[PDB]
Design a protein around this ligand. Structure first.
Ligand SMILES: *[C@@H]1O[C@H](CO)[C@@H](O[C@@H]2O[C@H](CO)[C@@H](O[C@@H]3O[C@H](CO[C@H]4O[C@H](CO)[C@@H](O)[C@H](O)[C@@H]4O)[C@@H](O)[C@H](O[C@H]4O[C@H](CO)[C@@H](O)[C@H](O)[C@@H]4O)[C@@H]3O)[C@H](O)[C@H]2NC(C)=O)[C@H](O)[C@H]1NC(C)=O
Ligand SMILES: *[C@@H]1O[C@H](CO)[C@@H](O[C@@H]2O[C@H](CO)[C@@H](O[C@@H]3O[C@H](CO[C@H]4O[C@H](CO)[C@@H](O)[C@H](O)[C@@H]4O)[C@@H](O)[C@H](O[C@H]4O[C@H](CO)[C@@H](O)[C@H](O)[C@@H]4O)[C@@H]3O)[C@H](O)[C@H]2NC(C)=O)[C@H](O)[C@H]1NC(C)=O
Ligand SMILES: *[C@@H]1O[C@H](CO)[C@@H](O[C@@H]2O[C@H](CO)[C@@H](O[C@@H]3O[C@H](CO[C@H]4O[C@H](CO)[C@@H](O)[C@H](O)[C@@H]4O)[C@@H](O)[C@H](O[C@H]4O[C@H](CO)[C@@H](O)[C@H](O)[C@@H]4O)[C@@H]3O)[C@H](O)[C@H]2NC(C)=O)[C@H](O)[C@H]1NC(C)=O
Ligand SMILES: *[C@@H]1O[C@H](CO[C@@H]2O[C@@H](C)[C@@H](O)[C@@H](O)[C@@H]2O)[C@@H](O[C@@H]2O[C@H](CO)[C@@H](O)[C@H](O)[C@H]2NC(C)=O)[C@H](O)[C@H]1NC(C)=O
Ligand SMILES: *[C@@H]1O[C@H](CO[C@@H]2O[C@@H](C)[C@@H](O)[C@@H](O)[C@@H]2O)[C@@H](O[C@@H]2O[C@H](CO)[C@@H](O)[C@H](O)[C@H]2NC(C)=O)[C@H](O)[C@H]1NC(C)=O
Ligand SMILES: *[C@@H]1O[C@H](CO)[C@@H](O[C@@H]2O[C@H](CO)[C@@H](O)[C@H](O)[C@H]2NC(C)=O)[C@H](O)[C@H]1NC(C)=O
Ligand SMILES: *[C@@H]1O[C@H](CO)[C@@H](O[C@@H]2O[C@H](CO)[C@@H](O)[C@H](O)[C@H]2NC(C)=O)[C@H](O)[C@H]1NC(C)=O
Ligand SMILES: *[C@@H]1O[C@H](CO)[C@@H](O[C@@H]2O[C@H](CO)[C@@H](O)[C@H](O)[C@H]2NC(C)=O)[C@H](O)[C@H]1NC(C)=O
Ligand SMILES: *[C@@H]1O[C@H](CO)[C@@H](O[C@@H]2O[C@H](CO)[C@@H](O)[C@H](O)[C@H]2NC(C)=O)[C@H](O)[C@H]1NC(C)=O
Ligand SMILES: *[C@@H]1O[C@H](CO)[C@@H](O[C@@H]2O[C@H](CO)[C@@H](O)[C@H](O)[C@H]2NC(C)=O)[C@H](O)[C@H]1NC(C)=O
Ligand SMILES: *[C@@H]1O[C@H](CO)[C@@H](O[C@@H]2O[C@H](CO)[C@@H](O)[C@H](O)[C@H]2NC(C)=O)[C@H](O)[C@H]1NC(C)=O
Ligand SMILES: *[C@@H]1O[C@H](CO)[C@@H](O[C@@H]2O[C@H](CO)[C@@H](O)[C@H](O)[C@H]2NC(C)=O)[C@H](O)[C@H]1NC(C)=O
Ligand SMILES: *[C@@H]1O[C@H](CO)[C@@H](O[C@@H]2O[C@H](CO)[C@@H](O)[C@H](O)[C@H]2NC(C)=O)[C@H](O)[C@H]1NC(C)=O
Ligand SMILES: *[C@@H]1O[C@H](CO)[C@@H](O)[C@H](O)[C@H]1NC(C)=O
Lengths: 361, 153, 153, 361, 153, 361
C-alpha cells in the first residue's frame, strides 16, 4: 500500500531571505584601493551559472533585506564622501578629494525644505563624526574609511515594512546661516547626482557652486551606511549592504577646491570640482549566501516574498540595472517533510537478506 | 562556513534553480520518496563535497556573530540528526518511522514550513521532534514486526 | 547555543527538578539500565527537540568567548560520540561494551564525577576513554560470540 | 546474570555551577531605557516551572559565582551613578541626575575611616574613568552607560573562597581636603541606601547634604561592576552579575542640584536630591543557564556546594528576597556512569532476529 | 579546541614522531588496511580521549578567528563523516566502497595530498568526494551481492 | 584477491605548517609581570616527549611561518622598549626604564646609512604610536604594553618567499638634526645588542651614549611586532611570533637616565643605562599546535618544507640555540588515502554471522 513518514532533509535546495535580524554578512569587493575589506578579486567560482532564472515564493519571520525601488526595499542614491585639506593661501579655502558612490538613499522631508528625515532613537556607541577640519591631512591621495556616529541618524524607511535608521553620516554642502540674515539659503546641495555615475562615463565632469556665503560640508566623516531596524523589531547594524549598492555603478573620483574672490565689494565663494576618473567595482557574496535579482514583491500583511522570473546571482557589477531589486538569501537549513513509501519503514535490510538467502536455497 | 565551490560540478545557484521546478510540486502535495530524493540529491551532493574552508575569505572576517550563529545551527542539526532513526534504504536524507498524521498536521502547515514561515499556522517543529523522538526508540523499531518474521518463516 | 523553549512540553527547570529525586539514588550506587533511562529520558527529549537558535537573543551577543567554548565542548562531545560503540537496544544514550571494574574504579570516583568534580579522587575521564576506545573495536565486538552462535545453532 | 557497562549520557539532567573561570554569560533585562543590552521583555518560556524546589549537592573545580549574604557569595548593596551638569548661575554649581541600583558591595576598611578596600593589582586596559566634568552634557535625560577603568579596583572578597576585585568605579560624595585644615571631613557619603530601593516605593524621597566645603563626586563614570577573580586563579571579568543584582529591587531615579549660599559670612554648599520615580526591572538567563536560589552553602575545604529546598529560577524581579542567595548554574555536559543490564552487550539485534525467525519455523 | 593532554598516555609529539617512520612508506605506495590502522591508531586514540576544553587557557583567547575557523573545519568534517558509508570491520577510520582507480588518480596525486599540497597536480578532494557520495548509496551497497548470497545458500 | 578502496582518516598523525594566511595562534608565556597574556606557568603536559626527533617532508599552499636564520624564515634580533620619565632637574632630561627582548629583526638599508627598510603599504587601523612624552608617567615600575601603529612599517622579508611587513614601532636612539649643521650624526644607535641577552648574564651591564646633540628615542610605544604578509598573498597580522622569539633568551631590564653637562662651553648629553636584572621566560604552544625545530629548508619553487632530524617541541626557553629554526605546525585535518584489503567491501557482518550460524548447525 502507501505509508507516509516524516523525513528530515538536512541540506535542502531551498533558500530563505536574509532578514534585518541577521548579523552582518560578508560582501567581498575586488578593489582594496577605494573600498575597505574584505577583498576578493576572483570571478565567481561558477560564472556560467550566474543569472539562472527562478520563481520565488517564500515566507519570512523578520523583514527581509531588500535593495531597490519597491515597497520593503531600500532605494539607492549617490552618496558623496569629501576630504578637505585647508590651504594657507588667502584666495583659497580648501582643496577637495571627493568620492561618489551608490549607497542607501535617506527619506526626505517634503515639508521641511527637502531635508533628510532624521531620528534620534537608539544612538549607538562609537566615535562621534568629526565637526572640525584636521589641519594635518597627511596621505591625502589614499582614502581612509573610518566608522563614525553621526549627530542624528537618517531614516531610510518608516512604513509598515518596518523602521530602518542609519547612524552613519550623510555629507552635503550647506551654509552657516545661524548668524546671517534671511537671505542666507538654508537648503543643502548635493555635489553629485545619479547621472554622474552612469551617463558619459569617459567624459569630463565638472560641478560649480557659487554663493556669497562660505560653503560648508557636513556631516563629515568618511563613513559608510550602517542601517538597522528599530521597529517592529530591533536588529543589528548592517554595514555590508552599501558594499552591494556601490558596485552597481562606477564610483567617481573628484578633485577640486573652494576659492574666494571679490564681487560687488563682497566675498564670493566658489566650490569647483572636476572628475575624469571612474572606477568599476565588483561586490560578491559567497555560498551559502546568494542574491535574488528582479521584481521582488514583499507583502507584509502575510509576510510573503514573491518573484516571477528572478535571477540568481552572487556578484554585482556596474552593468546592474536598477529596474530590478536585490533580495539577500541564504541556503535553507534542514526541513521536515512527509514522504510516501510503498512499504513499511525498515531499520535494516536484515529481513531482506534473510529472504534472499532462503530463496537462494 | 565559507567555501569556494570551484571544483564541484554544480554550484549553489544551479542547485537551487534546477530544483525549484520540482519544489513547486513538493509545495503542492505529498510526494513519493523517489521524487523527494531526486529533488534533494544535487543539494546533498554539493554539501557533501566541499574540501576545506577558504582561508583567503575566512581570515578577513571581522564580525563573527553571523558565522558563530550559523555554526551553532549546524551543530544543533548534526546533534539532532545523530539520534534520528532512519530507514536503511535512504542514506541521502533520514526517513523516520513516524507516520504522517494528516488530521493532526494538515498540508497547509507543511507548506508553510517548506516556505520558511514560523507563524501560528506553521508546522510546530519542536512538537513534531518530540513526537518523533518519543516514537523512534530502538526498542520499538529495530526489531522487525511479527508479520515480517512470520513471512520469512 | 541559545534557545526559547516555548513549544516544548518540559523546560530545563522541570527536567532538572524532577530528575534530582532519582539522581539521589543514582549518586548512591550503580543502578539498572531502565532506572538510568527513566532518569535521563526527559533531558534527552528536551535536547533533541529545540527548533532553532533564537535570533532575537543571539544577535545581541557581544562577547562570544563563552559561546565558542560551549560550542567547542559540544563539538568535541559529538566527535567522541560518533566513534562510540553502543548497545543496539538503548538509543537515548550510549552503552559501551567496556565492563565496569569496581577494583579499578571504586564507586567514590564515579560519585565525584557525577557531582562534577575534577580532583585527584575523581574518575579519570581521559584514561577511561582510552580504555573504552581500545576495547570497543569493531573487530572485537560486532561479531557475536561463539556462545550466541552455538545457541542459535 | 548481571553485567555492568560504562555508559555515556550526552544530555544528563544534571547542573554544574558557573565559575569565575567561565567567560561572561548573557543576562537579559526587559527595560532598555535604563539598562544596556542585551534586552528581552518576554516572560519566561515556562512561567509555571519557575520556583520548582530541588536539593543541590555538587562539587566544583573553580570558585562558583554566587550572590547574596553568605560565605563564598558576593553581598549586594546600592550603587549610585551620578550625572553632573555644570550651571552658569552664580548660586548653583551643578544639576544632578542620579540612578540608584542594587549591585555588588565592596568590602570596607573598618580601621581606615570606613572607606573601601582597594587593590591595584592587574589593572585592565580601557578608557580611564573621567576625572573632570564635561561642560557640554547633551542628551542629559537619556543615561549613557560608558565602560571605564577606575583609578584603583575595589575588593569585593578577600577570603579563603578567593580574591575578587572590580576595576569599575564606585561613586560617592566627598570633600577635597588636600589644602584645607583638619576640620574638613574625610569620610565619603553615599547619597542613597538600601531602604531607598525598598521602603515606601511610591512616597517622595529626599536627600540633603550640607557642608562648608564643596561637594565632589567620585569616582565618576556611568560604569557598572566588572568583577574578576585574581586568586587562587585568574579569571575573566564578569560584567553581567550586576544585571542580576539590579533587578532584585526597583531602581530609583533622582534629580537634584548643588547650591551655594552664605552662612556666617562663609560659603555653604548644599546638595539636594529628590525622587518620586522608581522603575521595576526583570533580568533573565536562558537555557542552558539557570539560577539556584536559596540557602546556598559553599564549603571550600572540600569544594562542595549544597542547598536544601532551593528553587530553580531563570528570572530575577523586584520581589526577590535577599535572605536567599543566587548560584549561577548551567546544564551539565555529558557524563560517564556504570549501568547494569541482565544480558551481555550486543552490537545488533541480528541474533535476536535469527532466533525469532527460527522459532517461527 | 584547546586541551591539556596530561592524563593521556601519549601526547601529540609522541604520536607524530612515532608515526612518521611508517608514514614514509605510506607516502611511498599503497599500503594494506592493517598497515594504515597501525599507523593511525594512536592518533585516533589521542583524539578520542580528551576530557574537556581547558578553561584556564580557553578563557584568555582574545582573537577567536583561528579558533572559529578550526571549529568550522572540524564541523564540516564531522558532517561529511556522518554520511560516509564505511566497512563494518574498521571503526577507527572509514573505508568507503569506492574502488581506487589508478588510471584516474596516479599515485603522485595521492602523495601530494598526503604531503598537504593543493596544487594542480594534487588529488582533487571535491571531485573525489562527489564520486564517493554518488557511488556510496545505501541502495547500492548495503544489500550484499548475489555472489555472497549464493555462497551462503 | 586484492581490493583497493578510498578511506578517510579523520585524525591522521600528520602535521601541516602554520602559514601566514592563518589567523594568529595562542602562545602562552609563564611570566605575566613582564609579558602580556595569555599566561600559563605550567610545564608541558608531557615533558618527557619534548625533543623527539622526526624527519619532515611536507608541502604548503601559503608561505609557512618560520623563525630563524634561513631563507623563508624571519631572523631574530634584540628589540628595545624604552619608557622615559621627564625630570624637573636642570641637569637631567629623563629617567629611563628599558626592556630588551629577542624579537623580529627588520631588514636594513645597506645603501641608506644602515637604516631600516620601510614600507608604507597597507597601513592598518589603530592608535598611532605617540610622538610626544606624557608628562604624568604613573606606575613607572610596571610596564604596560600598548599596541600602536607606527608612522611607517618595517620590512622583515622582501624576497621570493614573500613580502612581510610590520607596522609595530621599532625604538632606537637618534639625533634630531633637522635644523643642525652637517656635523650632526644621522645614524640611529641601538642601546642593546644580542650579546646583552646571552653573555655574562649575571654580570653588570652598562651602556653609555655621549654626544653634543640631545638623545631622542623613536619610534616610541611599548608595542610588539605584528608582522603580516602582503605579497604574493595578503594575510592577517601575527602578534604572537614575537612571544616565541622572546623566550629564546633572557629579557634584560635596564634603568637609566639622560644627563646634561658642559663641555667646551657647549651642552653635552650623556645617556647612561645600567642593568643587573635578567628574566628567563618560557613560551608554549598547545595541541593541536607544535613546533618543528632544526634545519628547516623551505624551497619555494616547489613549495616544499624539509628537515632531517628535526625535534618536535611545544615550549621555547632560554636554552634555545638559534642555529636551529622554528616552524609552526598544527595537527593535520582528515586525509583521503587508498587502502588495500583481501576481500570486498562489506556494509555489515550479517553474511558472516549467517555463515557462522550455518556452520554451527
Ligand atoms: C573589479 O571588477 C570590475 C567588474 O568586472 C572590473 O571592471 C572592469 O574593468 C575592465 C578593465 O578596466 C573594464 O574594461 C574596460 O571597459 C571600458 C569600456 O569598454 C567598452 O567600450 C569600448 C569602447 O572602445 C569597447 O571596445 C569595449 O568592448 C566595451 O564596450 C574601457 O575603458 C576599456 O577599454 C580600453 O582600455 C583597455 C585597457 O584598460 C584596452 O585594452 C582597450 O583596448 C581599450 O582601450 C576596457 O574594455 C570593464 O568594462 C569593467 N567591467 C565592468 C562590468 O564595469 C574591475 O576592473 C575590477 N577591478 C579590479 C581592481 O580587479
Ligand atoms: C520588566 O519586568 C518587571 C517585572 O515584572 C515589570 O515590573 C512590573 O511592572 C508593572 C507595571 O508597571 C507593575 O504593576 C504595577 O505595580 C504597582 C503596585 O501594585 C501593587 O499595589 C497596588 C495598590 O493599589 C495593588 O492594586 C496591586 O495589586 C499591587 O499589589 C502599581 O504602580 C501599579 O498599579 C497602578 O498602576 C496601573 C497602571 O500602571 C493601574 O492599572 C492600576 O490600577 C494602578 O493604578 C501596577 O500594578 C508590577 O508590579 C511590576 N512587577 C514587579 C515584580 O515589580 C516591568 O514593567 C517590566 N518593564 C518593561 C519595560 O516591560
Ligand atoms: C618561566 O620559565 C622559565 C624557563 O623554564 C623559568 O626560568 C628558570 O628559572 C629558574 C629559577 O629562577 C632558573 O634557575 C636559576 O638559574 C640560575 C643559573 O643556574 C645555573 O648556574 C648555577 C651556578 O651556581 C648552577 O648551580 C645551576 O645548576 C645552573 O647551572 C641561577 O640564578 C639560580 O641558582 C641560584 O638561585 C637559586 C634561587 O633562585 C638558588 O636555589 C640556587 O642555589 C642558586 O643560588 C637558579 O638555578 C632556571 O635556570 C631558569 N630556566 C631557564 C631555562 O632559563 C622561569 O623561572 C619561569 N618563570 C616563572 C615566573 O615561573
Ligand atoms: C580490574 O582492576 C583490578 C585492579 O586494578 C589495579 O588497580 C587499579 C587501582 C589501577 O591502578 C589498575 O591499573 C590496576 O591494574 C585488576 O587487578 C589487577 O590485575 C593485574 C593483572 O592481572 C594484577 O597484576 C594486579 O595485581 C591486580 N590488582 C589487584 C588485584 O588489586 C584487574 O585485572 C582488573 N580487571 C578485571 C577484573 O577484569
Ligand atoms: C579508471 O580511469 C580510467 C581513466 O580515466 C580517464 O582519465 C582520467 C585521467 C580522468 O580524466 C577521468 O575522468 C577519465 O575517465 C577510465 O578509463 C576511461 O574509461 C572511459 C569510459 O569507458 C573511456 O572513454 C576512456 O577512454 C578511458 N580512459 C583511459 C583508458 O585512459 C576507467 O573507466 C576508470 N575506471 C575503472 C577502470 O573502473
Ligand atoms: C515561472 O512561472 C511562470 C508562470 O507559470 C513560467 O512561465 C511559463 O512558462 C511556460 C514555459 O515556457 C509557458 O508555457 C507559460 O505560458 C508561462 N506562463 C506564463 C504565465 O507566462 C516560468 O517559466 C517560470 N520560470 C521559472 C524560471 O521556472
Ligand atoms: C582636476 O584638474 C586638475 C588640474 O587640471 C587635475 O590635476 C592634473 O592632473 C594631471 C594628470 O595627472 C597632471 O599632469 C597635472 O599636473 C595636474 N594638475 C594639478 C593642478 O593638480 C586633476 O586630475 C583633475 N581631477 C580629476 C581628473 O579628478
Ligand atoms: C541534478 O543534477 C543532475 C546532473 O548531475 C541533473 O541531471 C541532468 O538533467 C538534465 C535535464 O533533465 C539532463 O539534460 C542532463 O543530461 C542530466 N545530466 C546528467 C544525467 O548527468 C538533474 O536534473 C538534477 N536534478 C535535480 C535538480 O533535481
Ligand atoms: C530535600 O531533602 C529534604 C531532606 O531529606 C526533604 O525533606 C523531606 O521531605 C519528606 C517528604 O515531605 C519528609 O517526610 C521528610 O521529613 C523531610 N526531611 C527533612 C529532614 O525535613 C525534601 O523533600 C527534599 N526536597 C526536594 C525538593 O526534593
Ligand atoms: C525632583 O523635583 C523636581 C522639582 O520639583 C521635579 O521636576 C519637576 O517635575 C514636574 C513633573 O514632571 C514638572 O512639572 C516640573 O516642572 C519639574 N520641575 C523642575 C524644576 O524641573 C523632578 O521630577 C523630581 N525628580 C524626580 C521625580 O526624580
Ligand atoms: C602506538 O602506541 C603504542 C603504545 O600504546 C606503541 O607500542 C609500543 O611500541 C614499541 C616499539 O615497537 C614497543 O617497544 C612497546 O612495547 C609498545 N608498547 C605497547 C605495546 O604497549 C606503538 O608502537 C605505537 N604505534 C605506532 C606509532 O604506529
Ligand atoms: C631521518 O632520515 C635520516 C636519513 O635517512 C635517518 O638517518 C639514518 O639513520 C639510520 C638509522 O640510524 C642509519 O642507518 C642511516 O645511515 C642514516 N642515514 C643517513 C643518510 O645519515 C634518520 O634516522 C631519520 N630520523 C628519524 C627521526 O626518523
Ligand atoms: C641601575 O643602577 C641603579 C643605581 O645603582 C640601581 O638602582 C639602585 O637599586 C638598588 C637595589 O635595589 C637600590 O638600593 C638603590 O637605591 C638604587 N639606586 C637608585 C639611584 O635608584 C638600578 O637597580 C640599576 N638598574 C637595574 C639593575 O636594572
Ligand atoms: C626637531 O628640531 C626641529 C628644529 O628645532 C623642531 O622643529 C622639531 O619639532 C624637533 N623635533 C622633531 C621630532 O622633529
Amino acid at each position: 500500500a502507501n505509508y507516509t513518514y516524516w523525513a528530515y532533509v538536512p541540506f535542502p535546495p531551498l533558500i530563505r531571505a536574509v532578514t534585518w535580524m541577521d548579523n552582518p554578512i560578508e560582501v567581498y569587493v575586488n578593489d582594496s584601493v577605494w573600498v575597505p575589506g574584505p577583498i576578493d578579486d576572483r570571478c565567481p567560482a561558477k560564472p556560467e551559472e550566474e543569472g539562472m532564472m527562478i520563481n520565488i515564493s517564500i515566507g519570512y519571520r523578520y523583514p527581509p533585506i531588500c535593495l531597490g525601488r519597491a515597497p520593503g526595499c531600500l532605494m539607492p542614491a549617490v552618496q558623496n564622501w569629501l576630504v578637505e585639506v585647508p590651504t594657507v593661501s588667502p584666495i583659497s579655502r580648501f582643496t577637495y578629494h571627493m568620492v561618489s558612490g551608490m549607497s542607501l538613499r535617506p527619506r526626505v522631508n517634503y515639508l521641511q525644505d527637502f531635508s533628510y528625515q532624521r531620528s534620534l532613537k537608539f544612538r549607538p556607541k562609537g566615535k562621534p563624526c568629526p565637526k572640525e577640519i584636521p589641519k594635518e591631512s597627511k596621505n591625502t591621495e589614499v582614502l581612509v574609511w573610518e566608522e563614525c556616529v553621526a549627530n542624528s541618524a537618517v531614516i531610510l524607511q518608516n512604513n509598515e515594512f518596518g523602521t530602518i535608521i542609519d547612524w552613519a553620516p550623510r555629507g552635503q554642502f550647506y551654509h552657516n546661516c545661524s548668524g546671517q540674515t534671511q537671505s542666507c539659503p538654508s537648503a543643502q546641495v548635493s555635489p553629485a547626482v545619479d547621472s554622474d555615475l552612469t551617463e558619459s562615463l569617459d567624459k569630463h565632469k565638472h560641478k560649480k557652486l557659487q554663493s556669497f556665503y562660505p560653503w560648508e560640508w557636513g556631516e563629515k566623516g568618511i563613513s559608510t551606511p550602517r542601517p538597522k531596524i528599530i521597529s517592529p523589531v530591533s536588529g543589528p547594524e548592517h554595514p555590508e549592504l552599501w558594499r552591494l549598492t556601490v558596485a552597481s555603478h562606477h564610483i567617481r573620483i573628484w578633485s577640486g577646491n573652494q576659492t574666494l574672490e571679490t564681487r560687488d565689494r563682497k566675498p564670493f565663494y566658489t566650490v569647483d570640482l572636476n572628475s575624469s576618473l571612474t572606477v568599476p567595482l565588483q561586490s560578491c557574496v559567497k555560498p551559502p549566501y546568494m542574491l535574488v535579482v528582479g521584481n521582488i514583491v514583499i507583502k507584509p500583511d502575510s509576510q510573503t516574498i514573491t518573484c516571477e522570473n528572478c535571477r540568481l546571482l552572487t556578484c554585482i557589477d556596474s552593468t546592474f540595472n536598477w529596474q530590478h531589486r536585490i533580495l539577500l538569501v541564504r541556503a535553507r537549513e534542514g526541513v521536515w517533510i512527509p514522504v510516501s513509501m510503498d512499504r513499511p519503514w525498515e531499520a535494516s535490510p536484515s529481513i531482506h537478506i534473510l529472504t534472499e538467502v532462503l530463496k537462494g536455497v | 562556513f565559507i567555501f569556494t565551490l570551484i571544483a564541484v560540478i554544480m554550484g549553489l545557484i544551479a542547485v537551487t534553480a534546477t530544483a525549484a521546478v520540482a519544489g513547486v510540486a513538493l509545495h503542492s502535495s505529498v510526494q513519493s520518496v523517489n521524487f523527494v530524493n531526486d529533488w534533494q540529491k544535487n543539494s546533498t551532493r554539493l554539501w557533501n563535497s566541499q574540501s576545506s574552508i577558504d582561508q583567503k575569505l575566512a581570515n578577513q572576517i571581522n564580525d563573527l556573530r553571523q558565522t558563530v550563529i550559523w555554526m551553532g545551527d549546524r551543530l544543533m542539526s548534526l546533534e539532532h540528526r545523530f539520534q534520528l532513526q532512519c530507514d536503511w534504504n535512504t542514506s541521502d536524507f533520514c526517513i523516520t518511522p513516524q507516520i504522517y498524521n494528516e488530521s493532526e498536521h494538515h498540508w497547509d502547515m507543511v507548506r508553510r514550513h517548506l516556505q520558511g514561515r514560523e507563524d501560528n499556522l506553521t508546522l510546530d517543529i519542536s512538537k513534531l521532534k518530540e513526537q518523533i523522538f518519543e516514537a523512534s526508540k530502538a526498542h520499538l523499531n529495530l526489531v522487525p514486526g511479527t508479520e515480517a518474521i512470520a513471512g520469512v518463516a
